[PDB]
Amino acid sequence: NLYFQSMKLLYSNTSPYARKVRVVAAEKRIDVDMVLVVLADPECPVADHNPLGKIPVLILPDGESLYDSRVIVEYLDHRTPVAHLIPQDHTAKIAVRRWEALADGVTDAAVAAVMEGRRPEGMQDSAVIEKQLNKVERGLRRMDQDLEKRKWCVNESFSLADIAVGCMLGYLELRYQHLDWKQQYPNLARHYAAMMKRASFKDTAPVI
Amino acid sequence: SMKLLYSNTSPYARKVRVVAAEKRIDVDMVLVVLADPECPVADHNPLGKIPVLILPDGESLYDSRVIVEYLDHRTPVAHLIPQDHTAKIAVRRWEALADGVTDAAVAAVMEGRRPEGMQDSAVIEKQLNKVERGLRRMDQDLEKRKWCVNESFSLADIAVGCMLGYLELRYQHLDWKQQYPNLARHYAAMMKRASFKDTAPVI
Numbered sequence A: 001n002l003y004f005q006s007m008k009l010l011y012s013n014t015s016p017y018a019r020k021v022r023v024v025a026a027e028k029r030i031d032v033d034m035v036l037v038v039l040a041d042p043e044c045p046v047a048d049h050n051p052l053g054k055i056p057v058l059i060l061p062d063g064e065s066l067y068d069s070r071v072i073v074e075y076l077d078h079r080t081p082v083a084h085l086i087p088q089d090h091t092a093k094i095a096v097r098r099w100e101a102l103a104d105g106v107t108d109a110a111v112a113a114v115m116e117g118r119r120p121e122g123m124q125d126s127a128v129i130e131k132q133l134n135k136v137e138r139g140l141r142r143m144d145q146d147l148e149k150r151k152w153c154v155n156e157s158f159s160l161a162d163i164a165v166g167c168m169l170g171y172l173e174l175r176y177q178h179l180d181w182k183q184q185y186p187n188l189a190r191h192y193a194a195m196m197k198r199a200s201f202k203d204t205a206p207v208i
Numbered sequence B: 001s002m003k004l005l006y007s008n009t010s011p012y013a014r015k016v017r018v019v020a021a022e023k024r025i026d027v028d029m030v031l032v033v034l035a036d037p038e039c040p041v042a043d044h045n046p047l048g049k050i051p052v053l054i055l056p057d058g059e060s061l062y063d064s065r066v067i068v069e070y071l072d073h074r075t076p077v078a079h080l081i082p083q084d085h086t087a088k089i090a091v092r093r094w095e096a097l098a099d100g101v102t103d104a105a106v107a108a109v110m111e112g113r114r115p116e117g118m119q120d121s122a123v124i125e126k127q128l129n130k131v132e133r134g135l136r137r138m139d140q141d142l143e144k145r146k147w148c149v150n151e152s153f154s155l156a157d158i159a160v161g162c163m164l165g166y167l168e169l170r171y172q173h174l175d176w177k178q179q180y181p182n183l184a185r186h187y188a189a190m191m192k193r194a195s196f197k198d199t200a201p202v203i
C-alpha cells in the first residue's frame, strides 16, 4: 500500500451529505484526499468500506472507514482547534445537532421526491412526491421562522447547523430549478447569501 | 416532565425508549398510530416523523440520534455514549450502521406495500442486499466480543438490538440467527434485558 497516506473522502458531485462533509473539512482546515466516486463502479467498491453502499465515506490511514455524514462530521470537528463546528456546551450542541437533523431530514425528503420521479414510467406515485415535498415546505418554513432575528442558526456562531442548512438549500437548487424559495423565505435566502460567500461552501457547489 | 412521541412498531423510537429505560428516565409516553393525521407529530417535528421528544420548554428534539444524545447527558453517573472522543465515534458509527440497515429494511417493506402494479424489482433486491451486507459486517465485528465497543454496554448495542428486533417483525423468512451467530448471541443477551423486552412490539 502507501505510507504517509492521507484521509480519503469518497464523494460524488451531487451528494448534499458529501458536500456537508467536504465543507466541514475546509472549515477545519484539514487536508483530505477527496475522491470523486461513482456508486455503481467496480474499481472503487464502496461496499468494502461502507456496507450500506452510501457516500460519503471517510477512509482513514488505518483503512478503517467512518460513515454516515453525521458521524464523519463529529470526527473531523475534533481533529483541529480551528473552530468549533459542534459546540462544547451541551445546550448549544443539542441545538446544533437538532438543526442539522432538520436540514438532513428535509434533504432526505427531497431525495425521496427526486428518486420517486426517476422510477420506471409505470410504477411512479404522485402521492409519495406530494407527501415528501410536504416535509420540505414545512421544514423550510420552520427554519425560516427560526432565523428571524438571528445572524446564524445557534448562539450566533457559525456551526455545523449553518453548513447543513447551506448544503440543503443548494440541493434544492440543484434538483428543483423552479423552486423560488429565496423569495418565499427571506431569512433563509439571507443565510444562503452569507454562506455563498465562503470558499468552503461556494467551492463545493454540486455540478455535472 | 418530557413527552415522547412513539409508536408500537417504530424501531427508531424503541431505541430512545430503551435508552430512557436503561437511563432510568421517566418519560411521558405519547402513542402515535400509523393511520394518525400529520399532527400532533408535525406540530413538534416539521418532518412529521417519530420519535420526537418534547421538553418542558415545549421545545422539540428529533431525530433519534439527537434525542438519545440529549437523554444520555441527563443522568451523568452512567453513559451509553462514551465521553471519550474515540469511543464516542466508534459507537456513533455502529449506530449509523444499524440505523442504515433498519432504513434499507423499512424501505423494502415500503416497496412491498406499493400497489403490486407499481413495485420496482430493482429496489427490493437493492435494499435487501444492503441488509445482508450490514449484517455480515456486523456479525464479524462481534466475532470475539460481548458488547460492540470496549466490551461495555452502549448505545451501539441498543441500536443493534432494535434493528434485529425490526427484522424480527418484518423478515421471518430470513434465518439470520443462523448465518450471524454473533448477532444471535447479542440478541439473546439484549432480549434478557428488561429495558429491551418491555419495549418489544405488541402484536
Ligand SMILES: N[C@@H](CCC(=O)N[C@@H](CS)C(=O)NCC(=O)O)C(=O)O
Pocket: A012, A014, A015, A016, A017, A018, A039, A053, A054, A055, A056, A068, A069, A070, A104, A111
Ligand atoms: N445518511 C447518509 C446518506 C448518504 C447519501 O444518501 N448519499 C448519496 C446516496 S449513496 C446521496 O447524496 N444521494 C443523493 C444525490 O446525490 O442526489 C449521510 O447522511 O451521509
Ligand SMILES: N[C@@H](CCC(=O)N[C@@H](CS)C(=O)NCC(=O)O)C(=O)O
Pocket: B009, B010, B011, B012, B013, B048, B049, B050, B051, B063, B064, B065, B099
Ligand atoms: N430517521 C429518524 C426517523 C425515522 C422514521 O422515519 N420513523 C418513521 C416510523 S418507523 C416515521 O415516523 N415515518 C413517518 C413519515 O415518514 O411520514 C429517526 O431515526 O428518528
